């Protein structure tokens, strides 16, 4: 045993005397007040802590201790799990303070905005975007009431953050308005001869346009954002732009540049922040997105689980940042453990994603659509892999209503002709294929293919995947092998063009053609596709010797200017 420090003993003595010295703690130095409040959290006195943190005067001084912010994120979240709505109370208090000081000078307004920026950054880092948006709206109103140079800079820096909290809140219709306000303020800034850097705003707009599935415009603003990265930007801005740039490159089918972008982002996050930081977890989440979309699913589970374990540590349960990690790990575990049939860990994560999102967000929120979609995909495969026809009907019907709810949400938010509603159409087509309703399955796959080829060119990965699904519907079920053979050839051609001969998705097309020709004839075709499948299996076994992706990132591989310059040179 070792003697506990006089500091910690005195904190235990002050906390124990809490009723007699509740207001005297607020006169302590800002590095002692947070330790006392953390002792209140550790002792279990969540009610007293929640009463104190609901006051903006107390919480502002707590936010000034940036060393132990990882300790604060797990306290605040606990309060939000305790049932006390600390985020909305703090946002309301800040809005009231702003409404009170709207009639004042420019000295106290600048003080409140700086308090507003740290509070909004905390509320959007913890995942309370609907509650951080009010704080940033108040800050924007303060920066709008006057039109000086510093207030123009603060208005731009506040519309950058307001765009971010309207992207993670799935308010994509207000994101365009927020970007227009930011663009207006930046044009007025450049009118006076002072230029503000546009990397963070263009990166947030890239995330907006990618989340709306506007991948062409997303890549255009990706290039525009990377054209505005300097050596003096904060590491958070560079990390965010690198992440969204990698995601845009992935969905533009440009994995050769997305790899360097996202690996450099992960290296920067792990270097500056650490291995247990929320921003490092966000980089890991986007890196898992990259790895899942480059036929490298086996490593992606190792990345999402790494991303989730960081987010469960800093935040804890009942958080949207943990919920997104769950709904992404659930889909990656579903994809990885698809042929294995072991949807036990995949469903456990998808249950927590919906179990968290339903608690913290309304039933009409788009983030619930993606968590419902993954669990509906998992429930379908559990249904067809079980033997009870009662289970095969109950789970399939649950997946049906989940898919219809997700489709309704995506159709209401995006529209009839977006990529993310075509993905729900394709999933519904697969579900109807499993559910022995084929007339609707063909219609669903036709709609998904038509929407994803009207939008995403002719030879994209997504349209190839939906073509493969429709071809499996035609081959195994409808026996219309004339169309199924053509669709298999299209899917194989696109997969080979994009992923090469080592594509893991080519098995479901090679076996499909083997069964197709076994049904109709041409045993020379059966033999040729059988030996092609054997060569594919040999190549996949050769390529299966992979390593850990965090080690693939390594330490100090590139430099910040080098990656951006290489990306720009490669267009």
């Amino acid at each position: 045993w070792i003697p506990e420090t006089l500091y910690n003993t005195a904190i235990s003595a002050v906390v124990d005397n809490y009723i007699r010295s509740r207001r005297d703690i607020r006169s302590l130095p800002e590095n002692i007040q947070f330790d006392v409040y953390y002792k209140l959290y550790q002792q279990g006195r969540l009610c007293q802590l929640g009463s104190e943190f609901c006051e903006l005067e107390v919480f502002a001084k707590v936010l000034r201790a940036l060393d132990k912010r990882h300790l604060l994120h797990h306290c605040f979240q606990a309060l939000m799990d305790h049932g006390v709505k600390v985020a909305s109370v703090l946002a309301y208090s800040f809005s009231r303070r702003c409404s009170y000081i709207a009639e004042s000078d420019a000295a106290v307004k600048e003080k409140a905005i700086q308090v507003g920026f740290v509070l909004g950054g905390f509320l959007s880092d913890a995942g309370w975007y609907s509650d951080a948006e009010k704080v940033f709206l108040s800050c924007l109103q303060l920066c709008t009431l006057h039109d000086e140079m510093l207030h123009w800079f603060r208005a731009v820096e506040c519309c950058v953050r307001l765009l971010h909290v309207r992207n993670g809140n799935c308010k994509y219709h207000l994101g365009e308005e927020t970007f227009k306000l930011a663009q207006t303020y930046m044009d007025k800034l450049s009118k006076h001869g002072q230029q503000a850097n546009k990397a963070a705003l263009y990166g947030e707009l890239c995330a907006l346009l990618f989340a709306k599935s506007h991948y062409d415009e997303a890549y255009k603003w990706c290039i525009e954002a990377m054209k505005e990265i300097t050596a003096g930007l904060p590491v958070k801005v560079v990390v965010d732009v690198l992440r969204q740039a990698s995601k845009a490159c992935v969905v533009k089918r440009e994995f050769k540049k997305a790899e360097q972008l996202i690996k450099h982002a992960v290296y920067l996050a792990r270097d500056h922040f650490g291995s247990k930081h929320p921003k490092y977890s966000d980089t890991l989440l986007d890196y898992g997105f990259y790895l899942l979309n480059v036929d490298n699913i086996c490593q992606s589970v190792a990345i999402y689980q790494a991303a989730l374990d960081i987010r469960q540590s800093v935040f804890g349960g009942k958080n949207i940042h943990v919920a997104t990690a769950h709904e992404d790990l659930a889909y990656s575990s579903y994809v990885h453990q698809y042929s294995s049939g072991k949807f036990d860990n995949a469903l456990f994560h998808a249950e927590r994603a919906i179990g968290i999102i339903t608690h913290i967000l309304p039933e009409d929120h788009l983030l619930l659509a993606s968590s419902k979609r993954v669990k509906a995909l998992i429930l379908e495969e559990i249904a067809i892999d079980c033997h009870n026809k009662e289970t095969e009907q109950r789970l399939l019907q649950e997946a049906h209503d989940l898919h219809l709810s997700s489709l309704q949400l995506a159709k209401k938010a995006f529209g009839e002709f977006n990529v993310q509603t075509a993905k729900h159409y394709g999933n519904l087509g697969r579900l109807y294929q499993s559910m022995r309703k084929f007339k609707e399955a063909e219609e669903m796959h036709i709609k998904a293919i038509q929407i994803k080829e009207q939008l995403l060119g002719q030879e994209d990965y997504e349209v190839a995947l939906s073509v493969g699904h429709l071809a499996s519907l035609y081959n195994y079920d409808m026996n219309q092998y004339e169309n199924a053979e053509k669709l298999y050839l299209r899917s194989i051609a696109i997969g080979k063009k994009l992923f090469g001969e080592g594509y893991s998705g080519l098995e479901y097309d090679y076996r499909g053609l083997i069964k197709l020709y076994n049904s109709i004839g041409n045993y020379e075709k059966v033999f040729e596709y059988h030996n092609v499948l054997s060569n594919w299996n040999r190549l996949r076994d050769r390529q299966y010797s992979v390593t850990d992706a965090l080690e693939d990132v390594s330490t100090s591989p590139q430099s910040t200017e080098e990656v951006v310059q290489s990306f720009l040179i490669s267009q």
């Binding site: 579903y334 042929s339 995909l377 379908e380 993905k423 394709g426 697969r430 699904h469 499996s472 499909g512």
Partner: peptide, 7 residues
């Protein structure tokens, strides 16, 4: 299986 993974 008969078809590929979900999207």
């Amino acid at each position: 299986q008969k078809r590929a993974s979900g999207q």
